Amino acid sequence: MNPKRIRALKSGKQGDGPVVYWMSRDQRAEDNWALLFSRAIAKEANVPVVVVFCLTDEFLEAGIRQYEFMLKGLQELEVSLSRKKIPSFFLRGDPGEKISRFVKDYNAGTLVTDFSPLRIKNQWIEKVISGISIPFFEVDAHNVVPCWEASQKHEYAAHTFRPKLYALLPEFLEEFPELEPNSVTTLSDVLETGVKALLPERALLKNKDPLFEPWHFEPGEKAAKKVMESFIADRLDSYGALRNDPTKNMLSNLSPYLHFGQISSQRVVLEVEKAESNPGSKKAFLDEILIWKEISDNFCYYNPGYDGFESFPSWAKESLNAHRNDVRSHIYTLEEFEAGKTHDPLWNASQMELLSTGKMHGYMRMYWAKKILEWSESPEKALEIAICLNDRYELDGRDPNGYAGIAWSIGGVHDRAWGEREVTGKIRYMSYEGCKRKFDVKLYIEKYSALDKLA
DNA sequence: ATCGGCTTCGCGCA
DNA sequence: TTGCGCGAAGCCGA
Numbered sequence: 001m002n003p004k005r006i007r008a009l010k011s012g013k014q015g016d017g018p019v020v021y022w023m024s025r026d027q028r029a030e031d032n033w034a035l036l037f038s039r040a041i042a043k044e045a046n047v048p049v050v051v052v053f054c055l056t057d058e059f060l061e062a063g064i065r066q067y068e069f070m071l072k073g074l075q076e077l078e079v080s081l082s083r084k085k086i087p088s089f090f091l092r093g094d095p096g097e098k099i100s101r102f103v104k105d106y107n108a109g110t111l112v113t114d115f116s117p118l119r120i121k122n123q124w125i126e127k128v129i130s131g132i133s134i135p136f137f138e139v140d141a142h143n144v145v146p147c148w149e150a151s152q153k154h155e156y157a158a159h160t161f162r163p164k165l166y167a168l169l170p171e172f173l174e175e176f177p178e179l180e181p182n183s184v185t186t187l188s189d190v191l192e193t194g195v196k197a198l199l200p201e202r203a204l205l206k207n208k209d210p211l212f213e214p215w216h217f218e219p220g221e222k223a224a225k226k227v228m229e230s231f232i233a234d235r236l237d238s239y240g241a242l243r244n245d246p247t248k249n250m251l252s253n254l255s256p257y258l259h260f261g262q263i264s265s266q267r268v269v270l271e272v273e274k275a276e277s278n279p280g281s282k283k284a285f286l287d288e289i290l291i292w293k294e295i296s297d298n299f300c301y302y303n304p305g306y307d308g309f310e311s312f313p314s315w316a317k318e319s320l321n322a323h324r325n326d327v328r329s330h331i332y333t334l335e336e337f338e339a340g341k342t343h344d345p346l347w348n349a350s351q352m353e354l355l356s357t358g359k360m361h362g363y364m365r366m367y368w369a370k371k372i373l374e375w376s377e378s379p380e381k382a383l384e385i386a387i388c389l390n391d392r393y394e395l396d397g398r399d400p401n402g403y404a405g406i407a408w409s410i411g412g413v414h415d416r417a418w419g420e421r422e423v424t425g426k427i428r429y430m431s432y433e434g435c436k437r438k439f440d441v442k443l444y445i446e447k448y449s450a451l452d453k454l455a
Numbered sequence: 456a457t458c459g460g461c462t463t464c465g466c467g468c469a
Numbered sequence: 470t471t472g473c474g475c476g477a478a479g480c481c482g483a
């Protein structure tokens with residue numbers, strides 16, 4: 001393993017006991033540098049590797065849809081880990097408390113976790129650090145080039161990150177070893193209980209009939225790879241031409257798996273690189289999963305208020321402020337956005353895509369969030385509404401991409417200045433008519449308009 | 456220096 | 470829907 005995938009979080013004496021992979025972001029047994037490394041030090045100690053996952057209370061802030069997707073992924077993982085003799089333990093609680101204690105109870109010799117740039121994980125790490133004496137390591141298993149290694153600063157734009165990361169691709173883009181099994185020697189309950197809790201918040205149609213359709217994306221490591229393979233076969237070739245058209249099912253459809261780490265984004269790049277397809281489509285796509293994905297961890301990692309106005313660039317803040325008193329053509333409440341009650345059938349169409357498939361089309365997410373900004377009482381509130389709807393109803397939400405994408409859409413993070421307008425300042429503008437020139441808006445509206453049947 | 460060149464724009468034009 | 474050119478606009482970096 002390239003040792004620059006590892007960082008020390010805390011020194012100390014190695015216990016004579018097992019090596020505990022604190023799985024958190026990368027919920028997969030295959031193509032997992034964090035697990036691979038864990039096993040490897042457990043090989044140099046002749047002690048076994050275990051995996052522990054913290055079932056936290058944060059699931060009460062999103063929906064059954066996310067929770068179901070994830071827990072079902074885990075149930076398949078625990079098998080997959082058993083087949084390699086790697087036991088899988090599931091603590092129910094707060095990880096500061098629970099990881100440190102489990103390190104005590106199970107006499108852990110070394111602790112490894114994966115890398116996540118989100119505020120909460122660094123809170124939990126600092127808490128764990130205090131409550132343990134053993135070595136504590138971190139492995140960037142979610143990015144091709146480790147976040148702290150790709151750049152040491154916040155990147156103004158993709159066109160400054162991109163040389164930086166392409167300079168390290170040859171060293172860090174590589175194949176994955178095999179996960180060697182342990183030489184040395186309930187989840188079904190937790191899903192029922194939790195789903196029982198989330199129920200009175202479930203999004204329902206006027207007939208007690210749930211809104212979310214669960215069959216557009218089956219959860220798990222297995223399903224993820226079939227989605228990847230069916231994308232290389234059927235959709236990569238058209239990607240460059242149709243990635244901006246919401247009427248074509250032509251995206252990878254990988255983001256819900258990428259968020260939970262049910263698949264390695266590295267493996268996707270490995271497969272796509274070798275795929276003999278249209279160059280235009282490869283280059284566009286590598287650009288999204290490599291650059292736009294990893295600049296998002298970059299933003300969150302170097303900007304701890306990544307869900308705040310104050311991480312917008314100076315020009316964008318100064319511009320939005322100077323338009324705070326402009327008359328808005330419309331103002332909607334979070335309740336109104338949430339239910340698709342704006343003047344715009346295109347905007348509602350896209351919210352109905354979000355409510356029912358739990359995944360909104362890429363291009364329409366940009367439109368979606370810029371219109372939240374344009375028809376709410378203030379920047380701050382637009383951001384709140386946007387974040388809240390993103391994270392409540394996207395299978396891929398609560399994720400650095402989400403934040404960096406909302407920040408792109410509303411504060412121009414990683415963008416530039418455009419014509420100065422009412423309300424939205426010099427933020428890039430997107431128009432109903434611009435869409436109508438780019439795709440059959442009326443199809444998209446057709447498909448979802450019909451969901452005026454909400455509780 | 457200093458100046459090209461930026462995700463994902465809009466819009467007229469052919 | 471098509472692609473092309475041009476507009477408006479702030480700032481990084483070779």
Ligand SMILES: Cc1cc2c(cc1C)N(C[C@H](O)[C@H](O)[C@H](O)COP(=O)(O)OP(=O)(O)OC[C@H]1O[C@@H](n3cnc4c(N)ncnc43)[C@H](O)[C@@H]1O)c1[nH]c(=O)[nH]c(=O)c1N2
Pocket residue numbers: 243251252253254255256258259288289290292293294296360361362363365366369390394396397398399401402403404405406408409
């Ligand atoms: C307002 C808003 C809101 C969101 C997002 C963007 C915007 C503008 N995105 C980012 C992007 O829209 C989303 O990753 C894709 O639409 C996911 O669908 P596919 O995987 O099919 O995309 P597609 O196959 O076209 O792209 C492949 C992968 O590239 C990455 N990617 C694509 N567009 C990106 C972008 N603009 N920024 C960062 N990475 C990008 C993702 O990892 C994605 O899975 C996001 N993404 C996410 O993971 N979680 C979220 O909650 C959101 N929410």
